[PDB]
Amino acid sequence: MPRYAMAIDLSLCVGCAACAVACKMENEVPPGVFNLWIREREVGEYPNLVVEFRPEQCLHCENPPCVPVCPTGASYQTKDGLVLVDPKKCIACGACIAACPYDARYLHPAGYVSKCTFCAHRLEKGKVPACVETCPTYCRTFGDLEDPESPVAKALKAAERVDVLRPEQGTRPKLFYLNAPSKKGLTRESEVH
Amino acid sequence: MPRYAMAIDLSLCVGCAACAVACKMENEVPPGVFNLWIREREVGEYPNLVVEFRPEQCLHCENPPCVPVCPTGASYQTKDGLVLVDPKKCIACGACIAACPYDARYLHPAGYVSKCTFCAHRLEKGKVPACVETCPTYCRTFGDLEDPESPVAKALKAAERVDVLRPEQGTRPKLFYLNAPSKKGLTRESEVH
Amino acid sequence: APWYAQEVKSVYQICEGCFWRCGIVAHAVGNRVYKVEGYEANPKSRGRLCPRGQGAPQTTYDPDRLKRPLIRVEGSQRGEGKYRVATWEEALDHIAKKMLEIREKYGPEAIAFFGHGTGDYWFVDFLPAAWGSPNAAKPSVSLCTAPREVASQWVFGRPIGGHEPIDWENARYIVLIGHHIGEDTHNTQLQDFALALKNGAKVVVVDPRFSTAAAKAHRWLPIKPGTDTALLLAWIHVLIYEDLYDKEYVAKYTVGFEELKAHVKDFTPEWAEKHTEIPAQVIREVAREMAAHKPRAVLPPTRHNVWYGDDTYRVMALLYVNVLLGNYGRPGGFYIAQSPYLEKYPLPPLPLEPAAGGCSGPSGGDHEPEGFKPRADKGKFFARSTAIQELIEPMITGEPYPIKGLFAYGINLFHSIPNVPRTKEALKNLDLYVAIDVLPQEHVMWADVILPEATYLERYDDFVLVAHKTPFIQLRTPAHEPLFDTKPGWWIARELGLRLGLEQYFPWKTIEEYLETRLQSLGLDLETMKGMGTLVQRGKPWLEDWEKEGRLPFGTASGKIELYCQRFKEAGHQPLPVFTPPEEPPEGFYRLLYGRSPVHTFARTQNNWVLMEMDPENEVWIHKEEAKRLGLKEGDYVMLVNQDGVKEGPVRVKPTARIRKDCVYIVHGFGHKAPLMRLAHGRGASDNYLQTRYKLDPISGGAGLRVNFVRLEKAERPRLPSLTGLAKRPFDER
Amino acid sequence: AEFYGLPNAQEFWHWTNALHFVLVGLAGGVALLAALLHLKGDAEARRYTLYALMLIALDLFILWAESPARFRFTHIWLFLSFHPTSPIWWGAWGLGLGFLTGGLLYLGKGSQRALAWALLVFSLVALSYPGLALAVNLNRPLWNGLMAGLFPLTALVLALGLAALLKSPWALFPLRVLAGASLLLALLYPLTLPPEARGHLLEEAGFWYGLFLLLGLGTFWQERLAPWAGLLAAAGLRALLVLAGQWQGL
Amino acid sequence: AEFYGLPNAQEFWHWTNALHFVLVGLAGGVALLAALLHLKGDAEARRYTLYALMLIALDLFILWAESPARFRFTHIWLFLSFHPTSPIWWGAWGLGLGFLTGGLLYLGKGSQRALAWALLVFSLVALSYPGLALAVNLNRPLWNGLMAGLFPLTALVLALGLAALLKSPWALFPLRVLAGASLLLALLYPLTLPPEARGHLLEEAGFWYGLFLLLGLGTFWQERLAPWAGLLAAAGLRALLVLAGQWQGL
Ligand SMILES: Nc1nc2c(c(=O)[nH]1)N[C@H]1C(S)=C(S)[C@@H](COP(=O)(O)OP(=O)(O)OC[C@H]3O[C@@H](n4cnc5c(=O)[nH]c(N)nc54)[C@H](O)[C@@H]3O)O[C@H]1N2
Ligand SMILES: Nc1nc2c(c(=O)[nH]1)N[C@H]1C(S)=C(S)[C@@H](COP(=O)(O)OP(=O)(O)OC[C@H]3O[C@@H](n4cnc5c(=O)[nH]c(N)nc54)[C@H](O)[C@@H]3O)O[C@H]1N2
Ligand SMILES: */O=C1\C([C])=C([C][C]=C([C])[C])C(=O)C(O[C])=C1O[C]
Ligand SMILES: COC1=C(OC)C(=O)C(CC=C(C)C)=C(C)C1=O
Ligand code: SF4
Ligand code: SF4
Ligand code: SF4
Ligand code: SF4
Ligand code: SF4
Ligand code: SF4
Ligand code: SF4
């Protein structure tokens, strides 16, 4: 019934990869695959140099292309907006990886697809995700979008600007990048070459 | 040598179609068509009510899809970045209309296709475009993007954010919207209902 | 199957990820700490942790980690890697045997003790002093911090210290000279910096590289390297000559500024601009801007200060700017950090007990005839601190006097000390070489008897006390017992203490006993601390707390500006004029630079798969146009050859534009040549190996490192084992 | 939501042009038939060439009679320039040259296999350009890549459907194969669209679409309904995509 | 441009899932031949029905064989859930019911030629699903709408290529017709992509692409070159599009 979301204030992200490492430890994400990674890109030229540190992970899209594509039903979207995988039904076919626009998904070496989980295991015990917890810069917030006391909600409200990766896709990413450092918004590779 | 552009500050635009009427007048744009129009969209409920007034007209895309698709060579991009039509070659096939992602062109009743000209007629004689001159709010700026002194260059430099319509087509518009009212950026019909 | 829906045991710990020693909570399931977390109530981590802290646990579960003592196979050459497994007993006897031989032939001072880490209290500060060697050194002094500690001891009479006392939260204007925060991922500092960004604080980063901190800055001054002092002097000049400084602060807590004004007379924003390449106007503007925010404008001194070799001058100058903004001891700049009270274990005095900074009778009038031989680097620079890179010359020329026998406790000899060939030569020449430390790293293999030391999560370490607003104490309990034939450092020091007849210094049989005795002073018992972790004490932070009390904190009476008497009296001119134009790189070279990669803490983290996975190699930063002129592109690898011909393994080329054309930048700590650290092994380039030279700071012990130049030769992309494949080797607890 | 003035988002290609679209399909595909016939040395190659010429003429005539610049006489530029990136330019040259090539074939002048391969190539240009005239407009969500598949296959169903009405014996089997292909791709077409575009196609059309899908199924039923059904499905589908795909829509 | 960690942008369907793509082309294409041969009464309806059962089975084995989830036996869920939005799901049943159906047809029992209608339907589902399993991912620029057309056309080129090598008289002509349709759409495909997607395609594959296009032109020459040359072209393109389109790309 809530709408779970994550917001990352890029004006504060320094791209240390603490969240990324906290994730790997917590979810014991195996070598070679990542639920979370950082992307750092410069937009350039001296008087006007801009570096965007951008942590990427499952955005737990509100309209996830990775769910519909699943034949098994292992890819499901939860009532509060978490896209999760039930590995019991996963036939590791990769359809969801093909349909995920963000590279958030991987084949776990145990034979099923995995990806960030919004720390489902913690959310139920009433805790905040591990990446949100460890963040030194206090740039990531989390919570229920609909609860205005939520740290995501308040941050979205306080943001000077809010962006999302590949909005043009159908998805409605529920991971919001707040104050994007470049005036043109989130950095894209096509805008480089 | 210049790379011509236009910058419109949306934080100042009030959607009084002055520019739209000035162009209608200056360019004798016949009745049912328009090189320039204003779109006005509201975003949001009570305590966060934003209204975006947005003039729309040829963006004189730098990578104009409206040019390659033209069979005759009527549709052409100038060395300074103006997208124009040599009516003498225009067969009014409408290919350029099909290709323009911005509803910027029309079939003029004289038998050829027309659209915002960046007031090439005025540009050539050293004047600024009609829209730019008649504008109570001074939100539009024009100039050579390459000249750090030009009004557009300055405008862009001083902008809090810069946006462009449908950036994901890859047209590289040269009509920049500054300081869009909504945190999420330029308004799209898709983010409605 | 997930560690968290299974057995967990959660101890309060202390991170040995770096020396910030963040207080953490360690969660183990069996003998494997799976997650570590910061905890509020610990002023350092306050619930958060940096990447390295989160991944730090892996070393314990590193296959490659050291497991049992080892003794160099007699007859084999130190270079070679032939060792035989020894018993803790046989190793400790072998060491005590050799040490006493050296003692009874050369004296104790002929054994040098190099160390780093929490355990370095045993192997650097206590045990060598019990044994009477003054040649105990940490790289965090002359390879990092020494210029700023000397400068800070001269100017206030205090240390900047481990957890530097910048009142980040109330700062309104922060000027960073170097200080690549965000890359330097010291936990509380990043939190404090983030917070200050959040509260609207404005940041100015002075640095030839557009670094992460510059990415968050309102002004980036891409200063010409080695030119910072010129900038700072021009700031002192705008602050004084435009009369923007805090007069009463100057008038009441300062002594001697009537010397600074005259000194800086010609050090103009136009003079500075010539050298600096920062336009006079921006120079003037920044000075005015920090003045406009007076006592909430700070120029927090950076930590690694050992650049160029005239570094104490640079720090002095910068500390004067702070004084001139009258920010020291006020909200918004620096608070006064007081050490916490925790009584030492009662013991007889040590043969040698040093003083660390407080001077007036610094080195000369304080080291000579009293214990016995002086620190072997005693006359090389003015300051009394021991300079690690200055104690390895005796190892070779045997000059001042011979240094036979060297201990290397958790200290990278080939990565942390410049001039690796010299260090290697020094090792061969040794009668004894010991290497205590966790994984197998090039320098450890060169030892005569290696000692695996219980990982921070497996041992109890004597309390950590951090001077701070609020003085606190930390305690690390072992989450699970040592693995393999591994031992805690306090235990190794105790045995090597008993074996050398220093039993009076180690009258306590156990560390729990040792900790309890100490804990007893603060009506506290060990069990109790184990449930708290961190015991935070009061502490005075602002000048007003001192003053309303009748006292002021400093050295001699007040803050000496541009002063310190016995230097000007004898040995060296007093102020920072030494803007002294750095020697510029030869043609075809760049001035090597170096820094930190958020995920990695010096070179000891390359074999960590969790962390290597985030950053498997370093990358050389060269300007886009420079890279374009050389013929390099984004996919390219290159060898960096320094001015002395040393070549460093292929490193990826990063053209990307955040650097002057003047420079090149590589993260420190890569380029290991340690086949047994299977992941670390042949990746990236090592700056230390290219840092064949250094310019010694005559004042502090500093090894000025940014004085090396490097050239790029194209190289083939390297062939390396798959890191994931190596990451997957399971950890066999045996 | 509200405007002052209006964006020029009105239909630029009318029923008139959709007709051109159905016709150039016929034209091109009959020119392919004539080419392949000349190539098998089959006797019918001659009149199929006349037809491909007629349909080429009929198509150029309505391309011109429907052009707002019909009396400005600017189409000459179609032929005095080189615009390889433009489908309509390709289309002008394919048909045009395909009409000369097929003109000489008819008049037994200027060679004859080398003219039949030419007709083959120009008729592939003409069969190919319509779907691409649509498909290159990546701003129009309905004119996706499949248009480059739907238009060529559909132009074939038109030609073969015609050939079969004219009782040519060879064609009622290819007509069913190609009509099966076209209808399968036409059925999977909507599933190839982003939700909003499919929903737009379904709202604005569909029922017509779905009717054209059913219709075309009669190409596999009764012998003499088969070409009509195939013709109307293929033409209905072509015109409907042309009219319904002129949408930029967000 | 620089990362700490890495996006999981690694190939997800490897050369083995490109191999299955080729076989399910065959499996579905032949299953179509079979049902049509049934429906048509043809003597060969049996020969081809037991082939399609092998091809189908070979594929379903390769489908499980290549799945990292094989020894976890999770495929049973492919058949115990309703997931109409999922191309792959539709192919599980299309090949599953297509199997049973082809069993009940080969074992001449249960029912006759009402079952060939079911086999026809299931084969269309099996012919349709890969093509859509790719095109459904609107985040993959290369896998555009044409995949939904290029795969079924190409699967029949495979089925008819096989059929023609097992010397069935009927197979050559339709193989050369669908091979022409296949090859022409395959040629138009690049022109359908946005410039960066096309550029990616030409640098990543292309040669390979232009090779298989050229190779496929071999269906229109000799015999026992023809079925081969069209068969390698169809499987080339199929495997290459699966391999080259796993790009997300900006
Ligand atoms: N060239 C160059 N030199 C430098 C620097 C530089 O950037 N460039 N940085 C300088 C700075 S600022 C500093 S602070 C110093 C850092 O100096 P160091 O601490 O020397 O650097 P590390 O590479 O961290 O190596 C420490 C060693 O301790 C081992 N170790 C880790 N944990 C433990 C433990 O629990 N017990 C034991 N016994 N050993 C352990 C590691 O394996 C490693 O060998 O280096 C200085 N030296
Ligand atoms: N991840 C991580 N973080 C760490 C550590 C770690 O090992 N890993 N180690 C910690 C330790 S002990 C230390 S000492 C610190 C080290 O970090 P700091 O104390 O921040 O070191 P600095 O040299 O001050 O800053 C690095 C920057 O100095 C710049 N620099 C180089 N030359 C010049 C110059 O001439 N003028 C100026 N203004 N700038 C210049 C470089 O371009 C670089 O971006 O970080 C600590 N934090
Ligand atoms: O195919 C079309 C052609 C070929 C032209 C112009 C050419 C001639 C020979 C009259 C068009 O104008 C047109 O649009 C009406 C075509 O289809 C869109
Ligand atoms: C990607 O191609 C396919 C899969 O991925 C391996 C499947 O799992 C499945 C699952 C279904 C069965 C019948 C084994 C099908 C049908 C398929 O086509
Ligand atoms: S903790 Fe913040 S700054 Fe660090 S990687 Fe995560 S989002 Fe980026
Ligand atoms: S890999 Fe698993 S979760 Fe993903 S689509 Fe296949 S069955 Fe579903
Ligand atoms: S980001 Fe990708 S994997 Fe995550 S929910 Fe959205 S579509 Fe699925
Ligand atoms: S929410 Fe949990 S799983 Fe997702 S990135 Fe953060 S720690 Fe990892
Ligand atoms: S004239 Fe100015 S205010 Fe009026 S519509 Fe144009 S930009 Fe907006
Ligand atoms: S309508 Fe005119 S300008 Fe547009 S493509 Fe046709 S000829 Fe060119
Ligand atoms: S705005 Fe329209 S006319 Fe201008 S370049 Fe873009 S598509 Fe062409």
Ligand code: SF4
């Ligand atoms: S620039 Fe010219 S075409 Fe554009 S709105 Fe102004 S007058 Fe009209």
Ligand code: SF4
């Ligand atoms: S600063 Fe980071 S790496 Fe260092 S001890 Fe603290 S958490 Fe560990």
Ligand SMILES: [Mo]
């Ligand atoms: Mo340091």
